[PDB]
Design an enzyme around this catalytic site. Structure first.
Site, PDB file in Angstrom:
ATOM      1  N   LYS A  71      17.508  46.739  54.419  1.00  0.00           N
ATOM      2  CA  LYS A  71      17.442  47.199  53.030  1.00  0.00           C
ATOM      3  C   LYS A  71      16.905  46.123  52.089  1.00  0.00           C
ATOM      4  CE  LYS A  71      20.793  51.006  52.870  1.00  0.00           C
ATOM      5  NZ  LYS A  71      20.800  51.280  54.329  1.00  0.00           N
ATOM      6  N   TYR A  78      44.325  36.265  33.842  1.00  0.00           N
ATOM      7  CA  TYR A  78      44.843  35.378  32.817  1.00  0.00           C
ATOM      8  C   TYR A  78      45.229  34.043  33.452  1.00  0.00           C
ATOM      9  CZ  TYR A  78      47.756  33.388  29.139  1.00  0.00           C
ATOM     10  OH  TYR A  78      48.292  32.555  28.188  1.00  0.00           O
ATOM     11  N   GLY A  84      41.296  42.198  31.866  1.00  0.00           N
ATOM     12  CA  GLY A  84      41.222  43.647  31.899  1.00  0.00           C
ATOM     13  C   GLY A  84      42.584  44.260  31.644  1.00  0.00           C
ATOM     14  N   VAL A  94      47.198  43.027  31.618  1.00  0.00           N
ATOM     15  CA  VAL A  94      48.186  41.973  31.734  1.00  0.00           C
ATOM     16  C   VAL A  94      49.328  42.379  32.657  1.00  0.00           C
ATOM     17  CG1 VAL A  94      49.789  40.498  30.480  1.00  0.00           C
ATOM     18  CG2 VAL A  94      47.595  41.135  29.438  1.00  0.00           C
ATOM     19  N   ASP A  95      49.651  41.507  33.608  1.00  0.00           N
ATOM     20  CA  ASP A  95      50.856  41.656  34.424  1.00  0.00           C
ATOM     21  C   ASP A  95      51.857  40.566  34.072  1.00  0.00           C
ATOM     22  OD1 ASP A  95      48.994  43.392  35.678  1.00  0.00           O
ATOM     23  OD2 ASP A  95      50.135  43.309  37.539  1.00  0.00           O
ATOM     24  N   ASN A 148      43.539  38.082  47.648  1.00  0.00           N
ATOM     25  CA  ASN A 148      44.728  38.691  48.243  1.00  0.00           C
ATOM     26  C   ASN A 148      44.474  39.285  49.623  1.00  0.00           C
ATOM     27  OD1 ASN A 148      46.516  38.075  46.180  1.00  0.00           O
ATOM     28  ND2 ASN A 148      46.363  40.082  45.179  1.00  0.00           N
TER      29      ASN A 148
END
Ligand SMILES: [Cl-]
Ligand SMILES: [Cl-]
Ligand code: NA
EC number: 2.7.7.7
Length: 312
Positions: free
Chosen positions: A62, A168, A176, A178-179, A258
């Site tokens: 490709k 963050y 995008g 917040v946790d 992760n």
DNA sequence: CGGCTGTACTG
DNA sequence: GCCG
């Protein structure tokens, strides 16, 4: 980033596969695209293409069509549905399956969804905040969100640790979502806090909508007070102190970091979650002691990486 | 051929 | 899609 001329064409193809739910093919494309985006020099030889990990026979073929023809013929057989499926699946709570169903039913626009679709509770919230949810926030605002949650939590116990994770914590300029991860050093005083905190944040008018209320994790919507504020996605997680390091690692990400770490743990006969690094079952398996993130890295035979180094 | 991470909600 |  000597990539643009090739990747731009691949991303179109990648996104098409993604929104139509071909997640494995889209994964291959994502990884291939990421590699091209990080190679030292522009890709020239078909052999050079393969030379890159993540790029194989078909991706090479490709890339060669792009370098020569300047156009990829596959990009012409992408269903016309794609833009609409993307439009629909950017509603929080509606994925590929819902998007396709809505398309089949003749829906083409968010007006069609609003007026004619039957929406779940989450989807209705997602539609209400459609634009806001597509927006990023400056990291400074993430800081305010963190402190808002922290101040509310610390009211119940000043020893509670509250840490904003995600991009963050990886030191990004914009976020995008917040946790906020919450625990207590004494392994006990984290209990009871969850439901009380949420109710406090709601009474304060900070939480505007709830998407998911789990046992130890909440997903919802917040908005800071004053003019010129947008609705932001906020997760609040509470973990026992023994899980702190694994939860910091998971909630910090990135996504690719992760999954790579989890993949590596699996090769070493281990399993890695936000709860713990364990011995493989492949009884159940043993939870390995991991008081700090460094411990997770060391147990996997890896040198430590600071959050900013995990932005894969 | 088939894994490509492992978790936890909704209804 | 990639790769063992
Ligand atoms: Cl296939
Ligand atoms: Cl840190
Ligand atoms: Na969605």
């Amino acid at each position: 980033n000597h990539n643009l001329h090739i990747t731009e064409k691949l991303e179109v193809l990648a996104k098409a596969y993604s929104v139509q739910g071909d997640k494995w093919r889209a994964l291959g494309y994502a990884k291939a695209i990421n590699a091209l985006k990080s190679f030292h020099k522009p890709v020239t030889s078909y052999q050079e293409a393969c030379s890159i990990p993540g790029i194989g026979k078909r991706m090479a073929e490709k890339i060669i069509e792009i370098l020569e023809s300047g156009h990829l013929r596959k990009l012409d057989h992408i269903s016309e549905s794609v833009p609409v499926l993307e439009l629909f699946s950017n509603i929080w709570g509606a994925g590929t399956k819902t998007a396709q169903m809505w398309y089949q039913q003749g829906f083409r626009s968010l007006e069609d969804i609003r007026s004619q679709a039957s929406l779940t509770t989450q989807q209705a919230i997602g539609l209400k905040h459609y634009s806001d949810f597509l927006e990023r926030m400056p990291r400074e605002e993430a800081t305010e969100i963190e402190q808002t949650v922290q101040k509310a939590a610390q009211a119940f116990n000043s020893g509670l640790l509250c840490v904003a994770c995600g991009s963050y914590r990886r030191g990004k300029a914009t976020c995008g979502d917040v946790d906020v991860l919450i625990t207590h050093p004494d392994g006990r005083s984290h209990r009871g806090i969850f439901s009380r905190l949420l109710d406090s944040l709601r009474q304060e008018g900070f939480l505007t909508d709830d998407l998911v209320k789990g046992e130890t994790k909440y997903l919802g919507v917040c908005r800071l007070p004053g003019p010129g504020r947008r609705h932001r996605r906020l997760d609040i997680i509470v973990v026992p102190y023994s899980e702190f390091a694994c939860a910091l690692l998971y909630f910090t990400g990135s996504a690719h970091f992760n999954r790579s770490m989890r993949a590596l743990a699996k090769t070493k006969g281990m399993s890695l979650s936000e709860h713990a690094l364990s011995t493989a079952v492949v009884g159940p398996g043993r939870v390995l002691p991991t008081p700090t993130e460094k411990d997770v890295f060391r147990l996997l035979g890896l040198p430590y990486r600071e959050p900013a180094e995990r932005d894969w």
